[PDB]
From Swiss-Prot, chain A:
Function text: SIII, also known as elongin, is a general transcription elongation factor that increases the RNA polymerase II transcription elongation past template-encoded arresting sites. Subunit A is transcriptionally active and its transcription activity is strongly enhanced by binding to the dimeric complex of the SIII regulatory subunits B and C (elongin BC complex). Core component of multiple cullin-2 and cullin-5-RING E3 ubiquitin-protein ligase complexes (ECS complexes), which mediate the ubiquitination of target proteins. By binding to BC-box motifs it seems to link target recruitment subunits, like VHL and members of the SOCS box family, to Cullin/RBX1 modules that activate E2 ubiquitination enzymes. Component the von Hippel-Lindau ubiquitination complex CBC(VHL).
Biological or metabolic pathway of the protein: Protein modification; protein ubiquitination
Entry GO MF terms: transcription corepressor binding; ubiquitin protein ligase binding
Species, as recorded: Homo sapiens
Protein's cellular compartments: Nucleus
Protein's name according to its UniProt entry: Elongin-B
Gene transcribed to yield this protein: ELOB
GO biological process, one term: protein ubiquitination
Residues of the whole record sequence present: 2 to 100 of 118
Swiss-Prot record, chain B:
Subunit structure: Component of a CRL2 E3 ubiquitin-protein ligase complex, also named ECS (Elongin BC-CUL2/5-SOCS-box protein) complex, composed of CUL2, Elongin BC (ELOB and ELOC), RBX1 and substrate-specific adapter FEM1B. Homooligomer. Interacts with PPM1F and PHTF1. Interacts with the death domain of FAS/TNFRSF6 and TNFRSF1A. Interacts with CHEK1. Interacts with NKX3-1.
Localization, UniProt: Cytoplasm; Nucleus
ANK repeats: 1-25, 29-58, 61-91
Binding site for Zn(2+) 1: 28
Tissue: Widely expressed. Highly expressed in testis. Weakly expressed in other tissues.
Chain residues that bind Zn(2+) 2: 29, 61
Name of the gene: FEM1B
Residues the record lists as binding Zn(2+): 29
Protein name from the UniProt record: Protein fem-1 homolog B
Family: Belongs to the fem-1 family.
Function: Substrate-recognition component of a Cul2-RING (CRL2) E3 ubiquitin-protein ligase complex of the DesCEND (destruction via C-end degrons) pathway, which recognizes a C-degron located at the extreme C terminus of target proteins, leading to their ubiquitination and degradation. The C-degron recognized by the DesCEND pathway is usually a motif of less than ten residues and can be present in full-length proteins, truncated proteins or proteolytically cleaved forms.
Curated annotation (Swiss-Prot), chain C:
GO CC, alphabetical: Cul2-RING ubiquitin ligase complex; Cul5-RING ubiquitin ligase complex; cytosol; elongin complex; nucleoplasm
UniProt lineage: Eukaryota, Metazoa, Chordata, Craniata, Vertebrata
UniProt xrefs under PANTHER family: ELONGIN-C (PTHR20648)
Organism (species): Homo sapiens
InterPro entries the record matches: ELC1 (IPR039948), SKP1-like (IPR001232), SKP1/BTB/POZ_sf (IPR011333), Skp1_comp_POZ (IPR016073)
Chain's role: SIII, also known as elongin, is a general transcription elongation factor that increases the RNA polymerase II transcription elongation past template-encoded arresting sites. Subunit A is transcriptionally active and its transcription activity is strongly enhanced by binding to the dimeric complex of the SIII regulatory subunits B and C (elongin BC complex). Core component of multiple cullin-RING-based ECS (ElonginB/C-CUL2/5-SOCS-box protein) E3 ubiquitin-protein ligase complexes, which mediate the ubiquitination of target proteins. By binding to BC-box motifs it seems to link target recruitment subunits, like VHL and members of the SOCS box family, to Cullin/RBX1 modules that activate E2 ubiquitination enzymes. Component the von Hippel-Lindau ubiquitination complex CBC(VHL).
Functional pathway: Protein modification; protein ubiquitination
Oligomeric and partner information: Heterotrimer of an A (ELOA, ELOA2 or ELOA3P), ELOB and ELOC subunit. The elongin BC complex interacts with EPOP; leading to recruit the elongin BC complex to Polycomb group (PcG) target genes, thereby restricting excessive activity of the PRC2/EED-EZH2 complex.
Tissue specificity field: Overexpressed in prostate cancer cell line PC-3 and breast cancer cell line SK-BR-3.
Family: Belongs to the SKP1 family.
A Pfam family assignment: Skp1_POZ
Protein name: Elongin-C
Length: 96, 157, 96, 268
């Protein structure tokens, strides 16, 4: 039970994956919603490339690091792979 | 002091303790007049003995006065003895569980709503932090009590 | 099945249907002439609330769906001091 | 006891028709009901509902009297009006302690509804709910001390059924939930601390409201049982967390939020 956030430049996905699972499950559940093939999508997480289906833990996100309070921002890239151009959220106004 | 605490008279107990009596001395098995005050449900005697530092010590059966009070369905005495500044979580929840269990099978004090509520209160006290969670030492099932292997979760409770 | 939660900045915040339905006016927006009964977009328009308050609201959706019965283990939801008084009005408007 | 009840009721009616103070009469009459309860005898419903109507009328008259009167008479009227409120509480405890028919229960609920919508307040600001859950609510040394015990899980459920303002506040801002959490007998009385907390919470008590010193109900809890039991029933909401973060960070919430939300940040 670890909660992940898959962020493109504009869109954003909030998903959940089991601890005893691999990257294949999340690849399938992000292919199902975004209708894009798994080979085109790349989990460009923290300016680092990842693998396809080896291990959840070595990717970089764990149960403690990724929480529903603030999940880790996992980027997404598609083949043209594209560069990381994740548009940040709007800056809140400065409180007095 | 032991027989005075066992009876319903507290003036004699107060007079005895007012001249530095022995509220820590042991009786035949283990009683220190706390195990006798917490047997018939005399809350004032327990309060007086606790005030003059009667101390908490197991009896010959390994029963603290809190556990003796819980065994006899004395909710008042359990409430008083659960506030002692040294009670420990394991003893607090086992006293609450024993009180809830004792309310289930008794004649003078038979309440099944109190049984469920005290068992649930001790269950929620076990499962509140997640970290350093207190887990129940479930005994193997006994054929006499049907085949129920205790209730170590709030869902089954 | 999945609700695309647009923002005032154009950000898409696709979350689960059960996660978004914890809000009140999200369910009110989805019901009525806004079903789009093909479970492909389920878009709802937010032309008044910025992207960061959507980030907080969706994170709260995951937080509430995950944490519904866990005694006092309930972790503290982190609110930035600048993003409060904007998450407050957003949670009022969403009946969250 | 039937003849005594009838004679007392006739005397109370005669005194009420003459526009005279009846707080002592109502108090003695409730003492008579409590004494009759302590003897385990069947209780009539019509006299209960009639004295409930008389008590709500007397409390309204007491409010009318204290609205404008001299200072010594202000103290006398406040004392008599608080005594009338306590006697109404004892009468509600008596009513919920005995068995009544459907129409009689409906009439009793109507009388309690009328008094609740009258909104009575003591010196400290305790409504009918803040007194039915207060262990410091005084009980008369007579037979009322035998059956009228507060907090009571049956008076509170009756007041919630008749629609008492659950989130009402005292002069210190304490809700009806800031008072039951600090109960001093949680383990001994885990039936009026549970059936009240689980009643106020499901009746719409904000289990995060801050009193005048900014203390939530689980922050105003003097025992660990209430904290355990309140945190079970409490439900999370982003409007509560965001308002709590606004109040904690000392953000200016004046005219930057809806008018109905300036009250929400007022107590959350």
């Amino acid at each position: 039970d670890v909660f992940l956030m898959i962020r493109r430049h504009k869109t954003t996905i909030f998903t959940d994956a089991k601890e005893s699972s691999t990257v294949f499950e999340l690849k399938r559940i992000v292919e199902g919603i975004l209708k894009r093939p798994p080979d085109e999508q790349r989990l460009y997480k923290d300016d680092q490339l990842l693998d396809d289906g080896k291990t959840l833990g070595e990717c970089g996100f764990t149960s403690q690091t990724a929480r529903p309070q603030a999940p880790a921002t996992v980027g997404l890239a598609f083949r043209a792979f594209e560069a990381l151009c994740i548009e940040p959220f709007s800056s809140p106004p400065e409180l007095p | 002091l032991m027989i005075a605490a066992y009876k319903g008279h507290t003036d004699v107990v107060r007079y005895l303790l007012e001249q530095r009596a022995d509220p820590n001395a042991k009786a035949h098995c283990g009683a220190t007049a706390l195990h006798f005050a917490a047997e018939a449900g005399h809350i004032d005697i327990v309060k007086e003995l606790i005030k003059w530092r009667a101390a908490i010590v197991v009896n010959g059966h390994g029963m603290t006065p809190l556990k003796v009070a819980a065994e006899s369905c004395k909710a008042d005495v359990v409430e008083l003895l659960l506030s002692h500044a040294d009670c420990d979580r394991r003893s607090r929840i086992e006293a609450l569980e024993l009180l809830g269990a004792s309310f289930a099978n008794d004649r003078e004090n038979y309440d099944i709503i109190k049984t469920y509520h005290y068992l649930y209160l001790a269950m929620l006290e076990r499962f509140q932090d997640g970290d350093n969670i207190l887990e129940k030492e479930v005994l193997p099932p006994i054929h006499a009590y049907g085949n129920r292997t205790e209730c170590r979760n709030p869902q089954e409770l | 099945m999945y609700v695309k939660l647009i923002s005032s900045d154009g950000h898409e915040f696709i979350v689960k249907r059960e996660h978004a339905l914890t809000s009140g006016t999200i369910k009110a927006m989805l019901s009525g002439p806004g079903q789009f009964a093909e479970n492909e977009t389920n878009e709802v328009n937010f032309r008044e609330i910025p992207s960061h308050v959507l980030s907080k609201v969706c994170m709260y959706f995951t937080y509430k769906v995950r944490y519904t019965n866990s005694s006092t283990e309930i972790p503290e939801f982190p609110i930035a001091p600048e993003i409060a008084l904007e998450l407050l009005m957003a949670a009022n408007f969403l009946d969250c | 006891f039937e003849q005594c009840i009838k004679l007392w009721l006739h005397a109370l009616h005669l005194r009420q028709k003459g526009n005279r103070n009846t707080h002592k009469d109502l108090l003695r009459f409730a003492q008579v009901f409590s004494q009759m309860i302590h003897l385990n005898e069947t209780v009539k419903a019509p006299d209960i509902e009639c004295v409930l109507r008389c008590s709500v009328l007397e409390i309204e008259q007491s409010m009318n009297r204290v609205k404008n009167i001299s200072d010594a008479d202000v103290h006398n009227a406040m004392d008599n009006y608080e005594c009338n409120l306590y006697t109404f509480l004892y009468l509600v405890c008596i009513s919920t302690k005995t068995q009544c028919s459907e129409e009689d229960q409906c009439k009793i609920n109507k009388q309690i509804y009328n008094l609740i919508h009258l909104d009575p307040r003591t010196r400290e600001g305790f409504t009918l709910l803040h007194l039915a859950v207060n262990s410091n609510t005084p009980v008369d040394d007579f037979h009322t001390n035998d059956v009228c015990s507060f907090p009571n899980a049956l008076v509170t459920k009756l007041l919630l059924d008749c629609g008492a303002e659950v989130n009402a506040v005292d002069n210190e801002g304490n809700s009806a939930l800031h008072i039951i959490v600090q109960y001093n007998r949680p383990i001994s009385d885990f039936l009026t601390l549970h059936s009240i907390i689980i009643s106020l919470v499901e009746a719409g008590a904000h289990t995060d409201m801050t009193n005048k010193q900014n203390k939530t109900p689980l922050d105003k809890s003097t025992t660990g049982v209430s904290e355990i039991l309140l945190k079970t029933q409490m439900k999370m909401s982003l409007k509560c967390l965001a308002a709590r973060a606004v109040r904690a960070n000392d953000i200016n919430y004046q005219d930057q939020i809806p008018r109905t939300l300036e009250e929400f940040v007022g107590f959350h």
